[PDB]
Amino acid sequence: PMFIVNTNVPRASVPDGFLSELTQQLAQATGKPPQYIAVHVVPDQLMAFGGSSEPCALCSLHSIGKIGGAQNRSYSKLLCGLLAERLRISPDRVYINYYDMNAANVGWNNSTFA
Amino acid sequence: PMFIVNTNVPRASVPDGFLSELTQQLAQATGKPPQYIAVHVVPDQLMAFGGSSEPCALCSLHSIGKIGGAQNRSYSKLLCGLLAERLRISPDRVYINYYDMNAANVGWNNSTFA
Amino acid sequence: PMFIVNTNVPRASVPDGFLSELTQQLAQATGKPPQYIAVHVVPDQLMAFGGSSEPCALCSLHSIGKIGGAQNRSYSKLLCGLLAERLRISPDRVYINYYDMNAANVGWNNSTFA
């Protein structure tokens, strides 16, 4: 799985352990080994949500399977919780786009997963 | 809706109110309330279009509905126009990817829109 | 086609001419003229892969057609090879997401390809 967070919070406010915390929590939530999880955090962005530049986040989660109606509601609770606690972002200023990837459409280690 | 602009134009050339303008224009074009519109502008990027590093942009628009043949032409005229007027990017050096998102695949405030 | 590379390798390690090389190699691999290829390289990113911050990359390739099972294997060998040779990134620390875009969902030059 790969998880991307784009946010206007400054780099100095991103805790040093945040990428490792996300990796472990996503491994538990998805049931996948941590070795397969990639995380990308992009702070200091020029962003607005609802016309306001108060802290916000635009996120994406891509996974081969483990995406769906009930699962995505659970992921949204987990991730809004982490963003609220660690980055101080209000949960109504977070969007998360979920992508169920076909194995033939994910490249890794010179090949694809198909 | 969520609109992202990645561009090699320098940050100093982005006008002060550009995020507000995009928000209002997108609200009018999509018919969705400004409260739910997120905009993200990423300048100073290392980009090329057709092998050249003249000003260019790669953009994405994600929406739950309001995506389709005729609507997307209208959005492209609006958005290429704004980027040409405000950032001085030629419209033939802009790509905009459009994504019709399933409501179950957009997380917000501890749930999804399904 | 549009190709995006996000990496934690520093900007100073990106060779002169890399965006040209990517444009030329992707034109050959996809069969599309170079004029319609856009490339975007994002170094110095805060990223982890498998809970480690050793060099890694998250990439996307979006094309109108020319995406599929066997083609994506060929692209992954090509692109993992280039990232390994030019940026010193191990292929097992690269994900590439492939997107087959409908022509009606790509805006360019004030219109769409539909």
Side-chain angles (χ1 to χ4, degrees), chain A residues 1-87 89-114, chain B residues 1-23 25-87 89-114, chain C residues 1-87 89-114:
Chain A
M2 344 172 16
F3 181 66
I4 303 112
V5 182
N6 295 278
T7 183
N8 53 354
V9 165
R11 167 73 179 94
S13 297
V14 178
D16 286 336
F18 189 56
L19 281 53
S20 295
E21 185 172 10
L22 284 167
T23 298
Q24 295 292 318
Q25 293 271 15
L26 282 170
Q28 293 166 45
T30 64
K32 298 276 156 198
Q35 187 62 41
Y36 306 169
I37 321 257
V39 297
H40 181 194
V41 175
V42 189
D44 297 307
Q45 296 301 289
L46 183 62
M47 303 174 60
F49 195 119
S52 162
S53 55
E54 286 277 284
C56 64
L58 299 176
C59 310
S60 299
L61 178 62
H62 305 254
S63 183
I64 303 165
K66 306 290 178 121
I67 296 292
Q71 275 151 138
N72 297 351
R73 291 191 319 258
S74 187
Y75 298 145
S76 298
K77 292 176 187 51
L78 171 68
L79 295 165
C80 286
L82 280 165
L83 293 170
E85 184 177 15
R86 298 297 183 220
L87 298 195
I89 300 170
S90 178
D92 58 355
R93 293 179 64 73
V94 176
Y95 281 139
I96 308 150
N97 288 333
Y98 293 104
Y99 301 90
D100 189 1
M101 303 297 299
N102 194 284
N105 290 338
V106 179
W108 173 73
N109 198 26
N110 300 311
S111 185
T112 63
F113 283 99
Chain B
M2 319 161 239
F3 182 64
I4 301 102
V5 180
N6 297 276
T7 183
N8 55 352
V9 165
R11 161 75 176 97
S13 303
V14 181
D16 269 336
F18 188 54
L19 297 184
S20 294
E21 176 166 30
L22 284 175
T23 299
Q25 294 290 328
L26 282 161
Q28 188 185 357
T30 66
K32 302 249 190 172
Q35 296 87 63
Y36 287 115
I37 296 177
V39 175
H40 180 191
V41 177
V42 190
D44 301 301
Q45 293 304 286
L46 179 59
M47 310 177 64
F49 194 116
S52 161
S53 56
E54 290 284 297
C56 62
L58 297 180
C59 311
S60 302
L61 177 68
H62 305 256
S63 186
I64 300 168
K66 300 296 187 213
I67 299 296
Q71 294 135 15
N72 296 351
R73 273 200 298 287
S74 191
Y75 301 145
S76 301
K77 193 165 205 70
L78 167 65
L79 295 168
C80 287
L82 280 160
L83 295 171
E85 269 196 62
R86 299 291 185 250
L87 303 182
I89 299 163
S90 183
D92 66 341
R93 296 178 58 76
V94 175
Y95 280 137
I96 306 162
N97 286 338
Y98 297 101
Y99 299 93
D100 187 7
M101 300 299 294
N102 196 284
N105 291 331
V106 183
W108 170 78
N109 190 17
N110 295 289
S111 194
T112 68
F113 283 98
Chain C
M2 330 170 228
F3 181 65
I4 300 110
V5 181
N6 298 275
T7 184
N8 60 346
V9 166
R11 163 94 191 69
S13 295
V14 177
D16 178 56
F18 187 59
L19 279 67
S20 298
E21 179 177 18
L22 284 167
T23 298
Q24 295 156 10
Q25 296 270 20
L26 283 166
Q28 292 175 350
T30 64
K32 304 271 201 132
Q35 187 66 41
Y36 295 111
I37 294 170
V39 171
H40 181 194
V41 177
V42 191
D44 296 299
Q45 294 302 285
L46 185 59
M47 308 177 61
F49 195 116
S52 154
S53 59
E54 297 157 287
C56 61
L58 298 176
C59 310
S60 298
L61 177 66
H62 308 250
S63 183
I64 302 169
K66 307 299 192 146
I67 301 292
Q71 302 100 291
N72 295 353
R73 275 196 294 279
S74 180
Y75 300 146
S76 298
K77 189 157 206 176
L78 169 66
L79 295 166
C80 286
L82 289 177
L83 295 175
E85 283 277 287
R86 307 291 181 245
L87 299 187
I89 300 167
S90 184
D92 62 350
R93 298 179 58 76
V94 175
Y95 283 138
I96 307 160
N97 286 331
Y98 296 102
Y99 301 91
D100 188 1
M101 303 296 297
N102 187 290
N105 291 333
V106 182
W108 171 77
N109 199 20
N110 293 311
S111 188
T112 59
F113 289 100

